[PDB]
Amino acid sequence: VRKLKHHEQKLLKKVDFLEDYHKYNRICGDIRRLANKLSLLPPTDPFRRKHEQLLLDKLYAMGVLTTKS
Amino acid sequence: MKIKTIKRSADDYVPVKSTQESQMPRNLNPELHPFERAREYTKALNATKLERMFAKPFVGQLGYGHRDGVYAIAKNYGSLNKLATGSADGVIKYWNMSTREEFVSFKAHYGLVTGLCVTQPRFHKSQNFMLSCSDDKTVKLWSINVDDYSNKNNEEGLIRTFDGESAFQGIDSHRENSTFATGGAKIHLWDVNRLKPVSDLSWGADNITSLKFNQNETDILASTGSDNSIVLYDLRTNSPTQKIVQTMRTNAICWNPMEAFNFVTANEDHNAYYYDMRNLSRSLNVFKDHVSAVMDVDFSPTGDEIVTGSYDKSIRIYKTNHGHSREIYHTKRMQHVFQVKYSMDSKYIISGSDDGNVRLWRSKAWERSNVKTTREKNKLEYDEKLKERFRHMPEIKRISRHRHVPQVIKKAQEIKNIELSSIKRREANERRTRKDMPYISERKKQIVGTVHKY
Amino acid sequence: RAGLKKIDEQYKKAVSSAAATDYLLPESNGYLEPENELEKTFKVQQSEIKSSVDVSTANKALDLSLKEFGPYHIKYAKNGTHLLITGRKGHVASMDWRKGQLRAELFLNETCHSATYLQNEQYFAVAQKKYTFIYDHEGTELHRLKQHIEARHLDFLPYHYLLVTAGETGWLKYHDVSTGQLVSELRTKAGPTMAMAQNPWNAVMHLGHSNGTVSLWSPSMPEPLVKLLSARGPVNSIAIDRSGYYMATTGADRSMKIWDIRNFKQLHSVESLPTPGTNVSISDTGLLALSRGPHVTLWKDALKLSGDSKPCFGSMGGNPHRNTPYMSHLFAGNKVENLGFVPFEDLLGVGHQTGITNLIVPGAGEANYDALELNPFETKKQRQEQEVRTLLNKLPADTITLDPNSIGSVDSGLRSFLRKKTQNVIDERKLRVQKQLDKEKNIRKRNHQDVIEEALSRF
Amino acid sequence: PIEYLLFEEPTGYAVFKVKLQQDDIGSRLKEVQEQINDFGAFTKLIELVSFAPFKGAAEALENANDISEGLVSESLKAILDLNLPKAKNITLAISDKNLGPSIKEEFPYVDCISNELAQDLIRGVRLHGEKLFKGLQSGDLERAQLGLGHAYSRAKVKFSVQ
Amino acid sequence: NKKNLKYQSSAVPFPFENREQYERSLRMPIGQEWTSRASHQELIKPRIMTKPGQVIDPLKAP
Amino acid sequence: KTRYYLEQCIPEMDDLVEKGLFTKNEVSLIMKKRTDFEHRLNSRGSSINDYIKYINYESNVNKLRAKRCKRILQVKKTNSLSDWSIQQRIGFIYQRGTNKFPQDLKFWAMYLNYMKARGNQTSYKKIHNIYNQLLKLHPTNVDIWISCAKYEYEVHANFKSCRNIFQNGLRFNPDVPKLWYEYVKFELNFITKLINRRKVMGLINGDIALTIFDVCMKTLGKHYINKHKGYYAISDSKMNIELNKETLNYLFSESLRYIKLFDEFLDLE
RNA sequence: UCAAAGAGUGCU
């Protein structure tokens, strides 16, 4: 719509409904929920440690990580 | 066979000229305009929100104010932009409200200026006159050069002085004639061309704390005494007429310009009482939104609105038919409101507080003084009813009723609701057992006694 | 009495002003009556009406044949400048028939159920399979609604700025365009919604199901206003007249049902339909349109209480009580996808798989249009002025009601431990005192309202 | 309390009627001062009622001499008489305080105002100029002011083509 | 179908002295989309008026 | 505010339909043409021809109503709002056009003529009000000073006020020789009718002009000196002689023109 | 060119 006047703006706000990195943002977010939850799982567990290593190796094997992390 | 179809003439709806206004066809078929009741309500609600946006009552202050607290405000009933003020420093000022500047300033009195009134003395355009009284036992008449008309071209300063045996505490001027009345230890009637009091009026030995001539029966006069009494006077008989004793003193009296027999009283008991001059055994209306003593009260020249200036640092606007303030005006800059007067166009409010400043306030906070277009007009009065109609709509009440009030005022308000609730509960407990306890009307609790019974 | 009387005359004055403005209205609706009693309004064939109407109207009638994504559902904007037609296989194009310019072109290859303009020509929403997609005037998609899944019906409320979608999932989505938020989510419990329609008077949704019950729905309330079954079979379509007095449906069992919303009573029932209606439509003038297979039959003055007004196919020996079809048109070798009247013009649009056709029917449109509500001649700058104002005047969802006239009526440590003990005792006393007051009140009401035992009664 | 306003133009004298009186208390407010600038608002305040063009160059100078000395010319006496009612006393706005006594002498029934309120209206008239004349033939003021310039200023010094 | 307390008036507004009076006036549309331009002008009009910049004297003897 | 004007006419068409003069279809056509004019007059770029066109169109509507009144009702005047409303509204449009365009002397002229023709319907006081504004707006136009002087010396025959109009006009325009001639011509007309009345009085039983002559030379000379001299006096002695000569030549032609006036009046000496 | 978005000017 046209630019709303001052009194129009004050009465009504957030009425402006109706390069994109959305996928990479989702890729980054998905990596977060892993390491957050992989922390939730107990440290002595063998299943968590291998799974953490597979992730670190693989984002390394990508080059998202320039060095081992 | 016969066929006709909906047919649009392009020239009719799309003008041939670029500058010609296109025709706006209109059909008032009710079905074509659905959701009346939701619609007007939404226009109502938007108006209340907008009203709080433009509610901008303060406009400015007059010059640099007075040195000491301002304790006498006198308005020129024949001019818009003329005002007379005085403070306890003994200085009196005459103001040009348009330019917010002083016409002239006088060190009139050695003591505190206890009364002021603007007059047109008929000594037996180019100048105006004002009368001042104080506790130094003198009343002085002054003349002011003004620029209202340019038909001439001086003699600016003291014109005449009235010496008195006792201190003068209040002054008012008769409208039709040059005579004026002063209230001190004894209320005295004076004539301009006569140095000593023409007539002596007094109910008794008690002194008089204020007086206000009626604006319509200008021959009637009313006064207030230190003994919590209101005395009525008549000039045709040259004698007092009526006295009523109330529970607590009244500080100011003003007569309703649209209702001559009707006057309001500024009282010390957080209240302003609306009285009919004919039957004073009761009141017409009582105004109870103040939290300290009410110092001054004034009527609108429209007659539908009253302000009351209180010791609680607030000015409250009341409707004559409603007993609670629709509006509250306050500022931390306003230290003790002692005088509240109107612009006699009924559009602005003049207030005087002991901090030494005389402030100007809009009567209607959201109204603006500029000339509006008919379209601007027709929309603005569309809101005022639509707010009036849906005034008790709860959300409309919430947004409309809300005001920013000082913390001292509400902390005073919340407590008095507690003492009053304690009284009602405790009295109500006595209704369970006491056989004979009369119900006391609110309109008669403040009256202690009246001399002339009817 | 004088106050009640005084209030009365302003209405008789106000309606008098309304009667005064009725003269101001520039033009009237159309007519079609035969000069000779032998001539019949159903006998007249559409090409003859095309001849009678002037050149511009012949241009106003549009016929375009295209088969790529058939069938095509036609939807018509409120202001009516712009046509939106959505193909079944997925092709949707937005265009203005009067101007002759296409607003945007979408060639997406996803099966499409329905489409509709939301607030203006500029923004419109098109229902794809398993999701709802919104497209700009430029053709760019702005957002896609994850909440709205598998909706075969799209319906938008102008005064409330809310898009309602009905789908086979049965979950009724309430989405507000201005706030960009889903107002409420509700499950019908009547299964998939076969038919969807809105009543303009009260802005109440109407849903159709296999059982035949019609559920009246609003965003505000948890469960529907009203449940009515008029047709034994599934209700394929629901039509509500412009006034809102009359509500019309066609059952899948060939039943046609005329109903009243305000009184919730059945006007007329017709079981003589040869085949179940594809869709049923109602004019602003009150004239109803029904399409069955390749034949479309229209009845004038159908929405009236009188039995003689009852629609009847053809006539029974030319009986005056029988109501003949006002206009009868059949598209040979064709099927009608949907019917959309053309508000503000005297035409009826009909949707087919071969293409979209517009038929000219006298009296179809409203005679005169209010400029403030909607204007076909709205310029680019005022449509923005109209848009912002209608936003400013947005109606809340909770404001929805069964009757617009009903709304607005008048109805630490140890010390804190000691603190609780006292408050409990303080609270306990109030209960005791309140009991004594209640008991004393009862005594007031009671007071207000063997020979030997009497001798011994004193003891 | 203003009703009529006397404005002098180098082409002639135009008197105006004040339809609406601007608020006197709120004269210094922001919004009212803007109304003076806005032509649409101003036309609601006042309206053109008369205009009397000067016959020629000679009249403009001798009136220009008379206006300056606070004097009333025969043209000023003529235009005012037909307009201001005999009438309590009709109120006329004049930019000059010195011209006030001269008007009062000729016309006892008119009272003159030159307060800031009168100045506010007079300023607006000068601001819009011939736009308020609503098409009345005033030629164009700018060259008339310029033409009256060497008519007025250069008279006082007593040069000669000598 | 219970009515929403949010939209029910708490008490009868002034100047109307009875509940039925208000349900009547409430069935007026004041808006111009339902009311003729002129008919708007009698409804639109406020009771208290004033003219800017003039003198409101006390009433003279009737 | 176009709708306001449209609404003021509603009672009238209702009266037209009620009396049966105009059908609802014909009434609608009159409304549609009326609507186009009102938007035209209220819009930007509106000109006087719009007022004239609307007045001319509205005048025709009055004529058809009058013809149909005798044709259908068979009545000279039907006692209802229709009779005086078209006539009232035309004056309203004249007021707006004259108010909107005070400059055009032509538009004012029809207004006076239109109201003058309907003398019974428009009081002579209303003609007075129009002239007072017109003289006030255009004081330097001699034709209007002689206009109202001619109207009332013939229709009303008020010599006192007819003297007054000229008496005002000469105050504003003392340099125009035409206005002096008409005020002399009126003066001898008053004397001759007075003397002819005196002759008639006997049957059933002037210097003042020469004074108007006297001053008429003096001021015309003064103004002619003011013109042709510009802002300043003329230093050269010789030119001042030609300036005097030019006035004498200008002045004599003014006098000779009046000698021709005397010949017309036979009764006067 | 249309087509959507800004920022000034004239004037009711």
Swiss-Prot record, chain A:
It is found in: Nucleus, Nucleolus. It comes from the Eukaryota. Belongs to the universal ribosomal protein uS4 family. Component of a heterotrimeric complex containing IMP3, IMP4 and MPP10. Interacts with MPP10. Component of the ribosomal small subunit (SSU) processome composed of at least 40 protein subunits and snoRNA U3. Required for the early cleavages at sites A0, A1 and A2 during 18S ribosomal pre-RNA processing. This is U3 small nucleolar ribonucleoprotein protein IMP3. The chain holds residues 2 to 92 of 183 of the full protein.
Curated annotation (Swiss-Prot), chain B:
It is found in: Nucleus, Nucleolus. Residues 426-445 have a biased composition (Basic and acidic residues). Keywords: Nucleus, Repeat, Ribonucleoprotein, Ribosome biogenesis, rRNA processing, WD repeat. Its main location: nucleus. InterPro entries: G-protein_beta_WD-40_rep (IPR020472), Sof1 (IPR007287), WD40/YVTN_repeat-like_dom_sf (IPR015943), WD40_repeat_dom_sf (IPR036322), WD40_rpt (IPR001680), WD_repeat_DCAF13/WDSOF1 (IPR051733). One of its GO terms (biological process) is maturation of SSU-rRNA from tricistronic rRNA transcript (SSU-rRNA, 5.8S rRNA, LSU-rRNA). WD repeats lie at residues 65-105, 113-152, 163-200, 203-243, 245-285, 289-328, 332-371. The keyword Phosphoprotein does not apply. Gene3D superfamilies: YVTN repeat-like/Quinoprotein amine dehydrogenase. It comes from the Eukaryota. Transmembrane segments: none annotated. One of its GO terms (molecular function) is mRNA binding. Coiled coil: none annotated. GO terms for cellular component: 90S preribosome; nucleolus; nucleoplasm; small-subunit processome. Present with 6620 molecules/cell in log phase SD medium. Required for ribosomal RNA processing. Belongs to the WD repeat DCAF13/WDSOF1 family. Interacts with snoRNA U3. Interacts with NOP1 and MPP10. Component of the ribosomal small subunit (SSU) processome composed of at least 40 protein subunits and snoRNA U3. This is Protein SOF1.
Swiss-Prot record, chain E:
It comes from the Eukaryota. Transmembrane segments: none annotated. It is found in: Nucleus, Nucleolus. Disulfide bonds: none annotated. Involved in nucleolar processing of pre-18S ribosomal RNA. Present with 1470 molecules/cell in log phase SD medium. Belongs to the UTP14 family. Interacts with snoRNA U3. Interacts with MPP10. Component of the ribosomal small subunit (SSU) processome composed of at least 40 protein subunits and snoRNA U3. This is U3 small nucleolar RNA-associated protein 14. The gene is UTP14. The chain holds residues 836 to 897 of 899 of the full protein.
UniProtKB/Swiss-Prot annotation, chain F:
The keyword Transmembrane does not apply. GO terms for molecular function: identical protein binding; snoRNA binding; U3 snoRNA binding. Keywords: Nucleus, Repeat, Ribonucleoprotein, Ribosome biogenesis, rRNA processing. The keyword Iron does not apply. Disulfide bonds: none annotated. HAT repeats lie at residues 85-117, 122-154, 157-189. One of its GO terms (cellular component) is Pwp2p-containing subcomplex of 90S preribosome. GO terms for biological process: endonucleolytic cleavage in 5'-ETS of tricistronic rRNA transcript (SSU-rRNA, 5.8S rRNA, LSU-rRNA); endonucleolytic cleavage in ITS1 to separate SSU-rRNA from 5.8S rRNA and LSU-rRNA from tricistronic rRNA transcript (SSU-rRNA, 5.8S rRNA, LSU-rRNA); endonucleolytic cleavage to generate mature 5'-end of SSU-rRNA from (SSU-rRNA, 5.8S rRNA, LSU-rRNA); maturation of SSU-rRNA; maturation of SSU-rRNA from tricistronic rRNA transcript (SSU-rRNA, 5.8S rRNA, LSU-rRNA). Its main location: nucleus. It is found in: Nucleus, Nucleolus. Component of the ribosomal small subunit (SSU) processome, or 90S pre-ribosomal particle, composed of the 35S pre-rRNA precursor, the U3 snoRNA, and at least 40 protein subunits. Component of the PWP2/UTP-B subcomplex composed of DIP2, PWP2, UTP6, UTP13, UTP18 and UTP21. Interacts with U3 snoRNA. Interacts with MPP10. Present with 7520 molecules/cell in log phase SD medium. Component of the SSU processome, a pre-ribosomal particle required for the maturation of the 18S rRNA from the 35S pre-rRNA precursor. Belongs to the UTP6 family.
